[PDB]
């Protein structure tokens with residue numbers, strides 16, 4: 001059923017809350033035993049948001065391999081994503097270790113360091129060229145190379161150096177800076193523009209490791225980003241673009257990380273970004 005018509009039918013009936021609860025009820029439940037070990041309590045930002053054991057990213061160290069991060073593997077779309085929480089003061093070194101080990105090209109950040117007067121994630125990248133960051137626990141160095149500040153997002157070029165081998169890589173930081181403190185954006189225009197800039201970079205391409213995507217918990221805004229991307233890529237690839245069922249795509253993604261899309265408003269917004277993206281590829 002054309003997701004456009006399904007969208008008007010839900011809006012006219014005001015049933016967003018009822019669709020959203022049906023998704024929550026049918027979503028997968030898998031064990032997260034590593035996340036709940038006592039040695040990992042300070043590695044988790046939220047007690048109710050954990051990676052499943054089957055899909056968690058492992059750090060390449062014998063001490064403790066745990067990070068709050070999940071590999072989303074979309075078989076039909078041939079797209080992969082690492083969804084993770086905003087780094088904590090004691091997990092900034094782990095975060096950059098994961099970027100290095102997974103061979104990611106891009107980091108996508110969908111939150112501000114402070115929102116609603118509280119800290120949502122650590123200041124985990126350098127703000128001045130001449131003041132680099134060293135992570136002594138994981139033996140990495142991170143330098144700001146350049147910064148391009150636009151109205152709705154900032155793109156940064158970073159240099160990550162493995163101090164053990166003296167290899168360096170260029171990492172692109174895509175920072176969406178205008179998501180509102182409450183609710184969702186009124187138009188998906190600036191979000192959809194951001195996604196297309198991420199893609200243009202090569203960060204979402206198979207010659208690199210998976211893109212790292214985060215917000216504060218790594219499930220809400222982060223969920224919207226990967227759902228929108230996968231949706232639009234399937235429409236490009238299938239003989240019948242109207243066969244793309246956003247609710248079925250979201251349940252497949254929830255096999256890999258719990259809680260993706262946190263509210264009925266984010267579901268509606270996810271619907272709108274895809275419908276608007278659809279109504280733009282066609283040349284509306």
Ligand SMILES: NNC(=O)c1ccccc1OCc1ccccc1
Nearest residue numbers: 078079080204205206208209210211
């Ligand atoms: N940005 N990099 C990636 O998405 C990626 C990273 C590692 C391996 C493959 C990747 O994509 C292609 C692909 C996706 C899902 C299944 C099969 C193949």
